[PDB]
């Protein structure tokens, strides 16, 4: 602070940009999103636990998982409007790439372009920086999984599994126990439900159905985007719930 935290274009005397750190705090307070690489696909999950008191919301109507070309998963934690802005930009870059080259934009190039777009809103004294971190991921047989997470400061890193948003540390502690590169996405579903039950103290076995978005790109879906059907999420939810209530 000390007057150096009122603008995203002023460095503090210790070399820090405080508006960016305040955005980070906002994101860490927001809902949880995670993406996990498995043996035959990637699995993404958003836990909308901030909406637990919103009883009148239409069941399963709030979804934070989108896709780019029907084969890239993009999700976020942070402001919905800013995330929609960034997703629109991602799709616009994909359209432009196809128009120019007649092939789909590679994942890593798209990540670089999105991160540059985000970074450009941290440079001027009259623009609000985006308050959202983005997960962008794909999967195909030959390359296996690619998961990138873009920060509000504009830094993109590559992960085997990522958790952003609230309670991310506990989720990471649970995620890191098992090597999911040798587990199948279907089997990972139950693990994820168990992790949700433990880590998010606002989530119980009653609102697990209406507060969690599940999507994947896997062999079963021909390596194209798909929301996991309730006929697959139901047995996994029941099993996680009974196992947890046992202990």
């Amino acid at each position: 602070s000390a007057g150096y935290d009122l603008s995203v274009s002023t460095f503090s005397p210790d070399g820090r940009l405080y508006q960016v750190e305040y955005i980070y705090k906002s994101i860490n307070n927001n809902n949880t999103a995670l993406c996990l690489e498995c043996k035959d696909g990637i699995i993404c999950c958003c836990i909308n636990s901030n909406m637990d008191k919103n009883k009148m919301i239409k069941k399963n109507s709030y979804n934070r998982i989108y896709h780019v070309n029907n084969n890239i998963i993009i999700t976020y934690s942070g402001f919905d409007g800013d995330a929609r802005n960034i997703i629109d930009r991602a799709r616009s870059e994909a359209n432009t790439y196809y128009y120019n080259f007649h092939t789909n934009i590679p994942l890593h190039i798209l990540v670089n372009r999105i991160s540059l777009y985000i970074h450009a809103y941290t440079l001027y004294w009259h623009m609000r920086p985006f308050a959202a971190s983005i997960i962008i991921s794909s999967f195909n047989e030959k390359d296996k999984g690619d998961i990138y997470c873009i920060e509000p400061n504009g830094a993109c890193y590559k992960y085997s599994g990522i958790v952003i948003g609230k309670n991310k540390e506990m989720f990471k502690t649970e995620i890191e126990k098992k090597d999911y590169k040798d587990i199948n996405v279907r089997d990972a579903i139950e693990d994820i439900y168990k992790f949700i039950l433990t880590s998010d103290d606002h989530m119980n076995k009653n609102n697990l159905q209406n507060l969690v978005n599940f999507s994947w790109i896997c062999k079963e879906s021909s390596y194209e985007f798909q929301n996991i059907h309730e006929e697959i999420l139901t047995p996994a939810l029941n099993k996680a719930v009974e196992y947890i209530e046992k202990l």
Binding site: Y66, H67, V68, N69, N70, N71, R91, A94, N95, Y98, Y99, H102, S221, S222, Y223, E224, Q226
Partner: protein, 256 residues
């Protein structure tokens, strides 16, 4: 574009009892030169919509790009199968593009056919769309689709647009259309529709210099958009007088 340079000739699209059957020979000519003989001229827009073109190939490829990305963005926002754009929607979009370009005196040198299935009640293909995989190439039967649920639209260079039970472009507007107005009927089977389309294409082969007999057939049905295996159409002359030698005719006079 200032005028046609590389052109495709003619497309035929008709409704039959299981959906749309659209045909075009796989030929693109450089003037009177048949430079390309294996050209695709019918494109898939989505699982229920196809685009055929005659005229300039570059303009047709431009339009195909536009529609490909339009369908992609449609799928990006989809939350239920009803949200997918209908053939009527794409026909309106193409008619609008053409109208705007006419007003600038900058038209695409094409005639376009937009055809497909205008309903979502006959199957659940748009529940999980695959852009880069095809599962048809399971052992289910076609659904009879009511004619009113099928759509065949036409757009020309000036933006003229309309719909009908059968649409033709190019020389099919004379040769094929005559036989269709004479002989088309509702609820034809795939066999009858194919026979009629083949008769039209045979006449075109015999009377249109730009045409070929290597025919691509595409079907839009409850199973989605299906590309049939291209096939050579057998075209034999319908009179022995053509084959009679000239030397057997009288040598005197204008005998030729």
């Amino acid at each position: 574009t200032l005028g046609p340079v590389v052109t495709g000739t003619s497309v035929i699209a008709i409704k039959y009892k299981h959906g749309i059957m659209i045909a075009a020979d796989r030929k693109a000519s450089y003037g009177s030169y048949a430079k390309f003989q294996n050209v695709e001229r019918i494109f898939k827009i989505n699982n229920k919509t196809v685009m055929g073109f005659s005229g300039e190939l570059a303009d047709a490829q431009y339009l195909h790009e536009l529609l490909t990305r339009k369908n992609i963005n449609n799928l990006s926002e989809k939350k239920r199968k009803e949200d997918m754009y209908t053939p009527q929607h794409y026909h309106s979009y193409v008619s609008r593009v053409f109208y705007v370009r006419k007003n600038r005196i900058d038209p695409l040198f094409n005639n376009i056919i937009i055809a497909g299935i205008n309903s979502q009640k006959y199957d659940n293909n748009d529940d999980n769309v695959l852009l880069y995989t095809n599962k048809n190439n399971n052992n289910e039967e076609y659904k009879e689709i009511h004619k009113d649920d099928l759509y065949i639209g036409f757009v020309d260079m000036h933006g003229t647009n309309f719909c009908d039970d059968y649409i033709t472009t190019g020389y099919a507007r004379y040769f094929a259309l005559t036989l269709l107005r004479d002989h088309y009927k509702d609820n034809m089977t795939e066999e009858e529709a194919r026979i009629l389309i083949n008769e039209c294409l045979r006449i075109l082969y015999f009377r249109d210099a730009t045409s070929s007999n290597f025919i691509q057939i595409v079907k839009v049905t409850s199973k989605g958009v299906e590309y049939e295996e291209p096939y050579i159409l057998p075209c034999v002359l319908n009179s022995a007088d053509y084959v009679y030698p000239s030397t057997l005719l009288p040598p005197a006079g204008c005998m030729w």
